[PDB]
């Protein structure tokens, strides 16, 4: 339609929903030759309110190729270059915007900032250069006789580049940071955390898109080999943290290519995606070459699969539409299916036991990303080609045994990820004789793989029973094995369709033996016990043994993110965290939760949580929500990494698990110290979910905890207050603040709006003559049965009456002010009396007419009664105003 979309974007700006407006103007630019500058200007304003300053600068630079006399592009680019640290060109843009519109007050405020910033710019740059020179000679250029002081220099550079955009500019040092890091990575005799902290510094530095594309194209004048070096940096070392940090570097490369960020909820710009499309296809080709390269190790391959998972799918904030289609139609899907056919016992390229779930989540996300029925059909055609290619080589020879193994691995990875495609492949009647052949074999690995295939088949739907009718007794045969690798895989399935007491004892027997039984055994034991744990008797049975909980925690810390679904299902059922029997009672729920938290459930949760499964992270979020119910435990939950984990869960879980993670954060920070519980930049990113908890219409218990946590967060710094105002929270808080039969919600809303008055924009909106906010600030000071509302509103009345226009509006707009004032002057609570007399006193110091109105009123007798006996000094100050006038 190409024309109503900017109208919808303008309506989204007027609704103050700026990410929707950014997406709409990005959509409207895609349907275009003189309507483009309006789109770039309004999209620059939308990105500027979005804290996207690079994109605002880009859209203003593109909007000036049409008319260089454009005051909007100049002003918005001055703001964007201000927030990026380039104050000189910001000054020049704002100077040209001032000489083309000399009466705009916003440009005057911008010039008032930028002249003071340009007078001190050179000293700030040379001081920052001296700081990074000190820390960078002590970190990279070899002035250190100890490892931990080089570590301290690296942590200082990391905090400095995370503090400001100018800090990242100074640490970048026009591109000397990446030789200083690469000639440290290639030193194999250097410490792990040194290298990982250096790469964390580099990842923060590349968050800029221009520096990151510069970083991509600089290692070799041949483009694809520079791309290959950047993508193969993870193969330089075998440590997990190194591979994770290098994967974050490649994530930065993707985020600079498409101009996307899933952490910032930033859908990509297709103009800058098509602009450097060649770099995107080069990185995708190099990573899918890394999927099947046997010189690439296991965790590097898992990281590449996670990069495809996060980045390629356009339905999950990734690389836009047409790229995953190309990935399926070409040889990338077949590479994922070939990695799906792998086990550590039989692999062609290195594959760990965790690789299967990474492939399964990536394949499920890709099957979801094929949105139309034809592309889903092409997906099914390629998996049928791979299925038929495997099953045509399943001969009865020794060679065909490994193809039977590959076929079974393929189908298990199907049934753990894209479940319905797997169920469609199970209903082949050529498939179940292969299972009956490998189950009746002498090879124990084939017996185990048949057992885990037929437990992968057990779901709710009944058309899989076509195999399960022969699968369940065969499984009951395999439980009679004297091999534990077959016995636990047959114990799953027995636990999954259901005797139960006998099973639970068998799962406990496998799980308690920690040294002699490996994590491969205890994983399937934990999976079977997760299947059993829906019954509350076995819940109380698990909780009543402490050493079983210790064994589950040891399995979590040693197996890592391999037992996420199982342990998270255990923790969710034991905590009764699923929303809705004599033993699912809140005393018993509290007993189970306290026992879990007492023996390390939260470090187990943070140990298993390094996956991209939205469902398993939803389970972890529900577990942490049920953990954070109890007020004496939540400090230990904060101390055991719970706040950072829930801040990850509110970004990367399922859509209904984000809500549970946010309610968990609200519980954790309701009655806690926000400097300890949310230290530093964390207190920024906690503002985003908690405002989304504010539902005055739904009216749950999450609203009070969210108001208390935002009240605590609004007391630490002004940036928190501005971001609370930025997230459209003020009407949501005012809806609680207007409630009549809800005392404590109104009190918490008054406390939060009291702490938000120290932010000057909300202070100026409260004084402003549009609203009746001052009326409620005055009348809630005299609404006297609730001490806390009166204290908060009297404090706000004391603060808001050091503006004389607010004093005049309180006088002429609020009728029955003398009753309110004589009540808060005689007031029973000391804090309310003190702040109310402070407000009355600076009303009288504000004007002579208003002081003459007060002295000739009902308020004067109680003022002179207070002065003739802390709050007496404020009434004395008001009588000093009366003596002055």
Author numbering: 7 to 38, 43 to 508, 524 to 605, 627 to 915, 923 to 938
Could you pull the original sentences from the published paper?
In contrast, none of the ts-proteins shifted into the HMW fraction further confirming that the ts-mutants, present in a folded state, cannot interact with damaged myosin. Together, the cellular folding assay, the CD data and the SEC-based reconstitution analysis demonstrate that the ts-mutations L559S, G427E, E781K and L822F have a direct effect on the myosin-binding function of UNC-45, abrogating the interaction with the heat-damaged myosin substrate. To address the structural basis of the impaired chaperone function of UNC-45 ts-mutants L822F and G427E, and UNC-45 ΔTPR, we analyzed the crystal structures of the three mutant proteins. The two UNC-45 ts-mutants L822F and G427E crystallized in the form of a linear filament, having the same periodicity (85 Å), hydrophobic interface and overall domain organization as the previously characterized wt oligomer. However, when we compared the UCS domains of wt and ts UNC-45, we noted two major differences. First, the ts UCS domains adopt different conformations, as most clearly seen for the C-terminal portion of the UCS domain that moves about 10–15 Å. Moreover, as revealed by the L822F structure, the entire UCS domain is able to move en-bloc towards the TPR/central domain backbone of the UNC-45 molecule. A second difference of wt UNC-45 and ts mutants comprises the dynamics of the UCS domain. In contrast, the two ts mutants crystallized exclusively in one state, even when testing a large number of crystals for an alternate crystal form. Likewise, the L822F ts mutation causes local changes inducing movement of the UCS domain towards the TPR/central backbone. As for the G427E mutant, the established inter-domain contacts reduce the conformational flexibility of the UCS domain, which seems to be a common property of the analyzed ts mutants.
Subsequent studies in C. elegans, Xenopus, Zebrafish, and Drosophila confirmed the role of UNC-45 as a myosin-specific chaperone, promoting the folding of the myosin ATPase domain as well as coordinating the assembly of thick filaments during muscle development. To better understand its myosin folding function, we established an orthogonal protein folding assay in insect cells, characterizing the interplay of the C. elegans muscle myosin MHC-B with its cognate chaperone UNC-45. Structural data of various functional mutants clarify the role of the distinct UNC-45 domains in this process providing important mechanistic insight into its myosin folding activity.
